[PDB]
Structure 1
Amino acid sequence: GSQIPASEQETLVRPKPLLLKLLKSVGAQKDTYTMKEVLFYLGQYIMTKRLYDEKQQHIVYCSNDLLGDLFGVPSFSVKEHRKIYTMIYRNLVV
């Protein structure tokens, strides 16, 4: 479940306030982005907060970070792209 159509990646989206705060924390100071750009910046967020040092396995543990509050989960797999898109879609305006 790691494949996402280009059309979804390239669609413009408006993050809700908590997602916007996470994006601004890594220097993304816009209110409209493509989904791919959101995923780029959230990847940089994960790395900057040291939530993925064990790169030879797939899990991000986020129960002690605002990312866990945003996604509503204690952990997730980086390979499960569809599940991640669903969790981000719950944090977009309409």
Structure 2
Amino acid sequence: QINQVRPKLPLLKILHAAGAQGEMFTVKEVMHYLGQYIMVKQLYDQQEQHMVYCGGDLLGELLGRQSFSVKDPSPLYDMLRKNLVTL
């Protein structure tokens, strides 16, 4: 289905860790579970919550970065383009 994507294995692991089920998802679902992952693992900066620190986390390996800012999502979107297989 054109509105779905298939996350590559390591990204799927992250989504499943946050409660997702299955192999195919809409982009909004991917974002929901990835956000839940960051929230429950409390990877965001407590004082400046737009900042996410993920050094040593599988999320950091996917990003190729120790941290990123939700205010400049480009690196996050780059990771999703590489890890979301589309039609």
TM-score grouping bracket, smaller chain normalisation: 0.7 to 0.9
Unaligned runs of 5+ in 2: none
Q: CA deviation at 1:92?
A: 2.0
* Structure 1 vs Structure 2 CA RMSD: 2.0
1:32 alignment partner, one of 20, 24, 29:
24
TM-score (norm: length of structure 1) = 0.78
TM-score (norm: length of structure 2) = 0.83
Residue type of the partner of 1:14? R
Bigger mean CA offset, 49-58 vs 25-34:
49-58
2:52 alignment partner, SS class: strand
**Matched-pair identity in %:** 55
Q: CA deviation at 1:44?
A: 0.4
Residue type of the partner of 1:58? H
Higher strand fraction (1 or 2): 2
Tell me what 1:42 maps to.
34
Tell me what 1:65 maps to.
57
2:44 alignment partner, SS class: coil
Moved over 3 A (4+): none
Bigger mean CA offset, 55-64 vs 18-27:
55-64
Question: For the structure 1 residues 59 and 53, does the alpha-carbon distance in structure 2 shift closer, same or farther, using more than 3 Å as the test?
Answer: closer
Q: CA deviation at 1:91?
A: 1.0
Unaligned runs of 5+ in 1: 1-9
